[PDB]
Amino acid sequence: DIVLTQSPSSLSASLGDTITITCHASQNINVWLSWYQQKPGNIPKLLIYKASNLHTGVPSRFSGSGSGTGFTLTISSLQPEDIATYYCQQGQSYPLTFGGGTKLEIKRADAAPTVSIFPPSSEQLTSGGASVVCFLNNFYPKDINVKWKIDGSERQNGVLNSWTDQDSKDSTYSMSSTLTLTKDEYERHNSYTCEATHKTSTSPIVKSFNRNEC
């Protein structure tokens, strides 16, 4: 097989910027390289074939190039509807292989995550389990680290995290960290804390709740 190597794996840049994605191939593929665009959710649409040949629609700002083993795609004046994942694919021989992908991220001013802690639901307790959920909404950059603390300031490891893709409108991210215990084990302690560390603030953003009431 001829494995393609798209680089980098993800990129962030401001609007209007000109950015270059690249692909490399083990064996020579002459000029048989396509470039696809997959905006989060929607299907991939063909952007460029025969290395430079632009497909219908593709506004001039997209430019393919290269030959032999290295090819590059280049977007000028990043227009919002570019945010997607790009993949190159050789078409010299069988099997047809793609080159991993390169995901696009827009750059924006930093923003402070709105956190919120949620004690298990009485409905869940009745069931026999306890899940404390913490929502670190609307923020940027993606880099953030959260850590749970039971009584006092004791950290835990049995968590389940999940972030979303960069939001269309806000350009921000969101995350939902969930600690899942057993009723009993949840009952042995009193305080629960969701501690968040993030570029925006020096002092860790913390939201805590005491089981002493609810």
Partner: protein
């Protein structure tokens, strides 16, 4: 115009099969070469298959070679994929694409998920995440709902049937050991929530489960009215005391160790330290090895004081007293015991054989008759070749006509042991017997 609508395929376990159809419209389908491409959950792309203009020439990457069969019917305008002997690896999104040029997919279909798994379908559980009891009032009253434990993807979570879509977030479900978990957070603005309701709407296809958990505010932990057995102008008497004699066996037997027990019931769990004072013959035996210790119970405490005695002390008509006291006691409660003074008659002990009209059943009944004896106090057991026999039952002693007592001890045994002759003996122990111990048996 040109549109590809592949469809079919849901969920199937490993080793299974599934037929993927691809509907083509908008072009002379009969003139193009078609591709089947799959994108795994990891978002990576893989070329599944290619087919010639009129079939015949087909190609499949090593991976799928032997398992897949791409085909077409240049009539119904449909591209197909015959997947067989499925492996986990094949779990991915499937799209059919058209070759509109020099080795390039120009048009793709919508796509159809296929997950191969040896897991059973599980309906989810929804939980209304109301905010913290400590009502963090402000403006951004964010809420949320957890959807835990469901399989397989996906589920549709919507707030208020769709009416609310401004300020919501839905988190990509995660695979926690064969089961999924997803949460969604919504953030309201303006004094509108407590008043105007909000519900979490979640539906799961593979299990046909539509649940709507209304998010009700967090309310305090307290409920009213426990007992209705009328708190009448009632109460409890207080602790009670009882005293017990040693077993006639301990007392008549040198080796044994007789003891006098005093038991105190109805002890308040809040005042477990009762003062038990013992007295042999009105002279204090502070300690004298009085072994006390409590037991919890039905809901109360029971103190049990045991005072070891010297065999003779009991027989010499001494009087053991037990004086208990505690704060709730208006006056100390005392109890006394002493061996009842009276006549003494050795018991006539005979052993009766099972009645002839019973030598048929598998079990037989040996009867030990004990008569004309005083006082009540006695102890009889059955023995076999030395060891204390099991399965014998004793009547309580009854007062015969002539002021003496009698009583029987029944023994049930398997007929075989009876006719083959065995050492079954009635063994009585009573004060009026020489050496306080007789042993009767069957001259067989």
């Amino acid at each position: 115009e040109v549109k590809l609508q592949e469809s079919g395929g849901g969920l199937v376990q490993p080793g299974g099969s599934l037929k993927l159809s691809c509907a083509t419209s908008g072009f002379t389908f009969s003139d193009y070469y078609m591709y089947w491409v799959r994108q795994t959950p990891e978002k990576r792309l893989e070329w599944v298959a290619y087919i010639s203009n009129g079939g015949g020439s087909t190609y499949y990457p090593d991976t799928v070679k032997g398992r897949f069969t791409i085909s077409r019917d240049n009539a119904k305008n449909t591209l197909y994929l015959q997947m067989s002997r499925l492996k986990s690896e094949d779990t991915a999104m499937y799209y059919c694409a058209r070759h509109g040029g020099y080795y390039a997919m120009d048009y793709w279909g919508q796509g159809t998920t296929v997950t191969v798994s040896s897991a059973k379908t599980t309906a989810p559980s929804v939980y209304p995440l109301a905010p913290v009891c400590g009502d963090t009032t402000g403006s951004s009253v964010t809420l949320g709902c957890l959807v835990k434990g469901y399989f397989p993807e996906p589920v549709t979570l919507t707030w208020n049937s769709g009416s609310l879509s401004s300020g919501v977030h839905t988190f990509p479900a995660v695979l926690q050991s064969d089961l999924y978990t997803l949460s969604s957070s919504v953030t309201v603005t303006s004094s509108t929530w407590p008043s105007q309701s909000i519900t979490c709407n979640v539906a799961h296809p593979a299990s046909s489960t539509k649940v709507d958990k209304k998010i009700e505010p967090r309310g305090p932990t307290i409920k009213p009215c426990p007992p209705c057995k009328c708190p009448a102008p009632n109460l409890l008497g207080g602790p009670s005391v009882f005293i017990f004699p040693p077993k006639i066996k301990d007392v008549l037997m040198i080796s044994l160790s007789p003891i006098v027990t005093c038991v105190v019931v109805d002890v308040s769990e809040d005042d477990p330290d009762v003062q038990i004072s013992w007295f042999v013959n009105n002279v204090e035996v502070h300690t004298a090895q009085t072994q006390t210790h409590r037991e919890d119970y039905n809901s109360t405490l029971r103190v049990v004081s045991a005072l070891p005695i010297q065999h003779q002390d009991w027989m010499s008509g001494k009087e053991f007293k037990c004086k208990v006291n505690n704060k709730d006691l208006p006056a100390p409660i005392e109890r006394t015991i002493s061996k009842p003074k009276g006549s003494v008659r050795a018991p006539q002990v005979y052993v009766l054989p099972p009645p002839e009209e019973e030598m048929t059943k598998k079990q037989v009944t040996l009867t030990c008759m004990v008569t004309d004896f005083m006082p009540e106090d006695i102890y009889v057991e059955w023995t076999n070749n030395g060891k204390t026999e099991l399965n014998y039952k004793n009547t309580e002693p009854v007062l015969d006509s002539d002021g003496s007592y009698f009583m029987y001890s029944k023994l049930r045994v398997e007929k075989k042991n009876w006719v083959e002759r065995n050492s079954y003996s009635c063994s009585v122990v009573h004060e009026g017997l020489h050496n306080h111990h007789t042993t009767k048996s069957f001259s067989r």
